[PDB]
Design a protein around this ligand. Sequence first.
Ligand code: HEM
Length: 212
Amino acid sequence: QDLSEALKEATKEVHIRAENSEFMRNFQKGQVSREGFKLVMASLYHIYTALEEEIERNKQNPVYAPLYFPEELHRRAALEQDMAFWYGPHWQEAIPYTPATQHYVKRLHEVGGTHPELLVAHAYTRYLGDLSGGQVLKKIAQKAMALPSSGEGLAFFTFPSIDNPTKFKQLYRARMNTLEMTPEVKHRVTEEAKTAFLLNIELFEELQALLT
Ligand code: HEM
């Protein structure tokens, strides 16, 4: 198969499980509070920071380089605005850094530092959902918490350098399909995408526990 198809098939079952975690079921129903939302967003701040640091480190490596779209995709600067919005001018002192977020960040550093050929698993898992279902959660969050259409507090979910999320996803898939790909790399990429989903599920189960 093509790498973009392999990855979609490989993660379709775990996507179903992730969508139905308690935290995400509550989110989807509009039951997301400012408390829960700040927890998850601060956690994403550390995750995208590590992911994008490792993307920087490996930007010239042919095992990742074709997916190098900082201007279009990178989320850290957006996450920093959201952090100043949600936690105030001293957000760096204030934001939580949970065990599950730490675990996800540590795997991101291992992949980026020792297994860069798997980095595409982690970019795929985060960015492509951001450009899909993340747009649906954005509308739900705005309605649940009364966030203005103008976008404050939801910069993470807004891609000002992408005209069309769907056409962009399609370009990105096509580029994923030009990575030099052996059966070895392909097997391990799809397995690493399953682990990335699990890391997100464990984050959700932890935030949920923290909230109840
Ligand atoms: C309840 C929460 C979620 C909802 C409502 C949701 C919804 C969706 C939707 C509607 C799509 C587009 C599917 C299609 O048309 O084929 C999608 C794709 C995707 N989602 Fe989610 N999702 C959720 C949770 C997650 C989580 C936790 C992750 C990963 C951490 C994730 C990652 C992805 C990825 C990587 C894709 C792209 C699949 C592909 O096109 O290859 N989603 N999701």
